[PDB]
Design a protein around this ligand. Sequence first.
Ligand SMILES: Nc1ncnc2c1ncn2[C@@H]1O[C@H](COP(=O)(O)OP(=O)(O)O)[C@@H](O)[C@H]1O
Ligand SMILES: Nc1ncnc2c1ncn2[C@@H]1O[C@H](COP(=O)(O)OP(=O)(O)O)[C@@H](O)[C@H]1O
Lengths: 258, 256, 256, 48
Amino acid sequence: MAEYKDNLLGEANSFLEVLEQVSHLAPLDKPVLIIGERGTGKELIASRLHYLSSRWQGPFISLNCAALNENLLDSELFGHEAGAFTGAQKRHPGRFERADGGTLFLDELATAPMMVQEKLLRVIEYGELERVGGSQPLQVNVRLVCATNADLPAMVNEGTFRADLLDRLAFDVVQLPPLRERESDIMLMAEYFAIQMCREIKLPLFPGFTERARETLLNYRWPGNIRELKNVVERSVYRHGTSDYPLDDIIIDPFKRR
Amino acid sequence: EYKDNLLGEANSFLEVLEQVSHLAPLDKPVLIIGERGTGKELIASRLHYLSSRWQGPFISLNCAALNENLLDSELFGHEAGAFTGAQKRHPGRFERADGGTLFLDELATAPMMVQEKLLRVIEYGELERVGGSQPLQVNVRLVCATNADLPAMVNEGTFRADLLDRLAFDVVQLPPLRERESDIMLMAEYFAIQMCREIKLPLFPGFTERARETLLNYRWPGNIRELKNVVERSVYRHGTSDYPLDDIIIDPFKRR
Amino acid sequence: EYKDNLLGEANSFLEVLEQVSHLAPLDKPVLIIGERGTGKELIASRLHYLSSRWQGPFISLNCAALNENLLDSELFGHEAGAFTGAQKRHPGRFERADGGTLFLDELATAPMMVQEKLLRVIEYGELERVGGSQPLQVNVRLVCATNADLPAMVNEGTFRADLLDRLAFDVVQLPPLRERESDIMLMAEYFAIQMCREIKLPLFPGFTERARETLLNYRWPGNIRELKNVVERSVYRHGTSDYPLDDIIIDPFKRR
Amino acid sequence: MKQGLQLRLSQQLAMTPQLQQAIRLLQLSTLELQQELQQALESNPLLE
Ligand SMILES: Nc1ncnc2c1ncn2[C@@H]1O[C@H](COP(=O)(O)OP(=O)(O)O)[C@@H](O)[C@H]1O
Ligand SMILES: Nc1ncnc2c1ncn2[C@@H]1O[C@H](COP(=O)(O)OP(=O)(O)O)[C@@H](O)[C@H]1O
């Protein structure tokens, strides 16, 4: 029941809500999903579901479902008790076996390949996985949480991603709102970042913010968000490179040439 | 016996369950036809469960998920045959299934070479082997099961004609829940109860007029597989025990 | 004589039978121009079995269950462990048929590259075998067994010119099912008697007039496949010998 | 098929210089062996 807390940083009255919705499902062991756009602050949330569960005792391995080897998929996922180096006592590890009693994080689910998608399937609800070799398969108790920024329904129409896997996985999908829509925690997010930032670049103390600064930073549709705010602020700050006069200028894109 | 975890009262699922009993005795393979998510799996157990097939080790394997070489190999690959490589070769699911009821899912979506072999196995109790010529002859009772139109596939040659045309004696329907309209309510209730005993609530407070309206107007592509995800989803949206539910959710990709 | 199944009373059936006898003794490639469900390898079996040597194996099984490159693997197989997916030497398909004769199901289905491999090999009879080595030759009579107008495919260049003429040494076009007239009834009878023999029925009770009219109407897509399933399935649903058969199960997948 | 440089799996193998000598050890006759073994015994002072 212990709470990690970390950096909730939400003053949205909709991030509050976001925290509230996930909290109810934290105890739950059902498959879940997390959906975010290019700038959504979702990695913390996957941890905030498992951080808040009874099985908070469990290990929280989270694989990157996009980078696995096509060829080693069978081995990587399951693993083979015989290990290596002959009569060696060292046993093979495994993917799904190394997450019993703890939440498993799957990322880039939409991007995950057809071989991976078919391979998932059949292990999601059955609970039995058999390592290459042998005649015995052992049930694992593993909690599926999936984070994706891509739109699943469109993928289903295309046929690129199997429809059944998506349907079976996550009864409830958490909704994350874009930053242009928070619109409120920027005064707060922006300072927090900048405050960190001052010690990473080794300044003492923030100068302060011009009103204009805040006219620009409110006023913009912020394409691929949050992370975006950090970048707009972190650069702009190191840019300025001092602590006499307050911060006066922020650049949205360091592309434009001048 | 092993059928209450199914239910129904619309005469449709009634005539389905009536059918099961008569054909339960017969060991020889049957054909099971029904929509995606509508009793193929729940039904499957009942055939095995009927006293005629109750004793054996029942194995169900889906074919829509499996690969070209993998699918053929899994049913019967290198059980007795010895060849370079292929270490720790096994009999596979079909061999293990023998002496018990078997159900290989999604017969229509299978490799054409594999389909021909399957039909041969069904006929005259003979199973081919890469190693010894001696063919195994065990009366495993496995019935082919498909959801879509098998006959349509044969016209274009997608499905081997012989495999279907032989076992097109014993077809059984699983109607959608679209059609049912009576089983909805009673199932609603059952699942509901289960998700609140799951979250530790006092009591299931029932439905509203509005709830039912939307329940019964909704087209319900998915059936119990579907409905149930939705039933529980709606359960969890409320989490108190005072007034009956009036907000429900068929599409969690919606915003508000 | 292999019980002489599917006798055709109609002259067209008989003429083709006479033509087949002349063909079997000599080593000439033979092509069959019959529609699926009609002339289904029945005669293929006749033409390997009426030949000078019945000793040679009749592997057949060249249904296009393989879309492209697999067909090559199905055919000339692979070399002595060379390349990906190979663990041992695979003789394949003509080397297996050797001494005997070969049959092709929807020769029209295979890709031009496979065609081109058929033509070079047959004259010489030497086969490359994909992996490659020293040219190897064996003598096999070819039978081929397609379903649409073939000249279409060279008129729209999809069938190789030299290969097509060389391969259809001699056509044996075959009868449609609808073209058979009074042979329906005989078919019906044969199949009905065979069926009651299979299901251990005492005797056959006969037919009625209503079922007779139903058969007289029907369009009948399959020469063998469409009508045979109908009659045995009629006989299975009946399962009795006291009352004559009156009900027809026309389509096994019809609702309710 | 296709040509590529992928990876396979499932096997077992291990060896070392000293173990090797231990393995070749049983391939030769006792009389011819005892010779090899006498030679060890000059080199090693605590083995009799
Ligand atoms: N509520 C928050 N509190 C603190 N930092 C946040 C918050 N939301 C976003 N961030 C910052 O933005 C980044 C979000 O990246 P991430 O969630 O991994 O993107 P994605 O979910 O698209 O992969 C984090 O590195 C984090 O520092
Ligand atoms: N009456 C019931 N009681 C308990 N569980 C049920 C009932 N009806 C359906 N289910 C569950 O719903 C699931 C529906 O699966 P389904 O989509 O029919 O699989 P398939 O598509 O392979 O037939 C089944 O796995 C079954 O356990």
